[PDB]
Symmetry: D2
Subunit: 249 residues, 4 copies
Amino acid sequence: GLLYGKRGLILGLANNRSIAWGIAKTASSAGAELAFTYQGEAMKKRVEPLAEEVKGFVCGHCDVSDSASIDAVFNTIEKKWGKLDFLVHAIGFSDKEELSGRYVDISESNFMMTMNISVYSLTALTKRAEKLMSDGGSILTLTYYGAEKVVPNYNVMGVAKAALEASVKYLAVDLGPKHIRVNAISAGPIKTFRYILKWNEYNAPLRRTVTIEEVGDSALYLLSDLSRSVTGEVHHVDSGYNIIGMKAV
Amino acid sequence: GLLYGKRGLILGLANNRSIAWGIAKTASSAGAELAFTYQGEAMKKRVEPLAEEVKGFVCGHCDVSDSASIDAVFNTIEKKWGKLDFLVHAIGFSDKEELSGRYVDISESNFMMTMNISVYSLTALTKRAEKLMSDGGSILTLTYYGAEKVVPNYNVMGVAKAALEASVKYLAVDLGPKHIRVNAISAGPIKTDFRYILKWNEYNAPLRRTVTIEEVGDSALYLLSDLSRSVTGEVHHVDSGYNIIGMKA
Amino acid sequence: GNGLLYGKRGLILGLANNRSIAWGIAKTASSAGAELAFTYQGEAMKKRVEPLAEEVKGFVCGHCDVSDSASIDAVFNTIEKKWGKLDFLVHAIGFSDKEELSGRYVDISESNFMMTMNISVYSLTALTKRAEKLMSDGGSILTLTYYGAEKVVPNYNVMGVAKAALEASVKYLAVDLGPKHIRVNAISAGPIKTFRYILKWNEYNAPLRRTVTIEEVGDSALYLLSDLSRSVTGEVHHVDSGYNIIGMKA
Amino acid sequence: GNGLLYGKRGLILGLANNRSIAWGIAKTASSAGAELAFTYQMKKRVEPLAEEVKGFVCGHCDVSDSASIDAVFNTIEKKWGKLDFLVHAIGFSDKEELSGRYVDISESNFMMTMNISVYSLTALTKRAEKLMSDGGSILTLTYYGAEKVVPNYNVMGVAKAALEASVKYLAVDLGPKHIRVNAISAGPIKTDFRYILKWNEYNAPLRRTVTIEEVGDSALYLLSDLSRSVTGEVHHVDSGYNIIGMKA
């Protein structure tokens, strides 16, 4: 019952294999009533049954690059609930092709789109969410170790996640006095790139990669009152990978 | 029921105002059966009623500088339980007088004692606990922001906590293959020169309040439970976000 | 003087006036033996930069708007024609909306965010892409950052978020170019007297109990630009009287 | 040469041979104009190195022995009256226990490591403070094992974490007297260890391991007036290894 009576919005549920789904499954089981967005009709058809499974509801189309799209979603939530207890931001994009390259070869267009969709979107969603969380709440986003250290084939996404993590802290200072907490989970890679997985599997302290159910439980903590004195935190849920400085010999 | 059926050892319960007590109260209420050590008769008399209140038990005198003393405690636990699921290290010492001074004026003797009691003790306890510990167990210690940034009147304790945090990571790698997790909570100061540190946190922490032992308790619960099963080597800030500010705010 | 940049040729972007870190770097680098090239943006700045370049025996290589790809190409073409090779590059460029700095970070506009990211972050990557071809021999690329990238500082807001992105990009670039022995580093400068709150706060709380000057940042830049620092890359180097290490008012 | 330490006088602790970081620092500092004093705990090996650099041997120093430290600083005070900088290239941990698991270390190794590798900087600095009334620079050495878990480093990693923190506390104490305190985090140097070298060689951004002459030049910077606004800094001189998050 850690989220009994709580109402939350999850952005980014695209399928039943994602972190967002892990979070939705755990939050729902913990008592949360959940609202879900989608982008495009194809995704809507995928999300509807997932929402039903969790006794949640689909609150509308959201393109985070479209300001009016975001306003419509929050207007719908305001009408249905009047208040919001938490928000999960599991959204990020970067050009698949340019990930394999050298960071220095990225295009301006990919850089800008990555920053907008993967970083600015959290700030945009939070600006609209603030009015609905007058009582307090919890905002969670997702990040990755590539923000801190150079990881192959993460390139601009690493730069973006570094920006995101810094924004989590600035947001935490802005919203702290209203008791809205803002935190990130730094998730290890998830068996759902084969190089990054295997590397984690053999070198992470726990000798396995993490699952969406595990990231889900860590999200539950950060979303619930158990974490009511935690804000501005980048929380590693990665089998301890982030602490190693070199392979064992 | 987050600790249903679990058995744990808490070192450092000295009174009903400490973090250890907050942790005991929450862990017990989540289903844990708890064993408690003490140092000296005066403390024993204070700890006995606290132990009874939580339906735990007092497992003996422990001086963490005394190797045999540590062996006796773990022998008592082995005889009573045969296994240990988690261990809480809320132990630390440094010369009260030398805290007010300049770090450079500390005595060799204070330095050595601080390192032994506040740092080495975790490693000594963990070495002995390893044989008893269930696959999937959890070891938690306490640290403070003074390990990361210079905080007035923390001096050698800051240096010691920096060592402790590093030891958490080395321990996490050693015990990771047995799935024993090792983490630290970096607690904010708690309303219990020190008045200055409290007030400063109160006005400048993002959440505009200092944290309580019940709050640190709930964060401990998360780290001790299966909710955090993919988290190891972590220094987790439970400090109202104070650690993220760069200036009076 | 010290001869640490004897025979070296470098490009400095961002010299707007004689009070900036860029000028501190130019003055020290020139005295250390460097021949320097300088860009400008717009005719007003050109008139300010020309005499500064003359004072340092350097030369003005043209108009550069870092948001304009062809503008950047023209500058590097000019440098290639004159020198054929480049030993170092200083990126002292950054912009954010002055009005939105005073606000809450959460109230920033999408437009300010995007422009700040482009001018303050992406520009280093754009400049480095062009510079790579001219630094076949190896070289040093230096940018500027600030503690607001690491901790929350009042009225830095989106610039803090941008500088965190910049610092991360320095590391990714350092990995890309490391095998060609091009180093990429940043100086995290303390604030400089030439915002009054940020100065005074540093002055009273920094370990050294004073703020830093452009000449001091200049000498730290010299180190990073010279062969003295030939095994240093991906580094965010604090030149701030130690301010970054304090956890509380003194 | 560059004259960056013209007229400056410095004490280097830890010169044990001509392959060490201390030697790289001595060579560069001397060539930049410094007169250098050297301790030993080894005398025969240090004497010719000291002569080569036009420096002098100021005596036996066991950093665990308080009187030993006092005698050394008394000798420096009599000879010079003032000290411009100090290099702390001292560290010890039990060679055998490095190969093991961190959790298996002995109390005795732990305590000795903390004393010789960490407390010694504080002890030396306490004495050095009185001689640096004009200001100065204090430099120690560390390694990435202080920040992330690295093979074969164990209690030394824990110790170096302590050292780095002590650098910052010392920087705050001595900052108002304009004494700067910094550390260089050096990469491993070609001088299981073959594996650590090769790993850095193939995965460090610069694709090579660093040399004592390179660490020397970085030391020169931190010891000189070029770095007069830099204190409390852990400076990586490791071909950028510290920034990578995975095999290349």
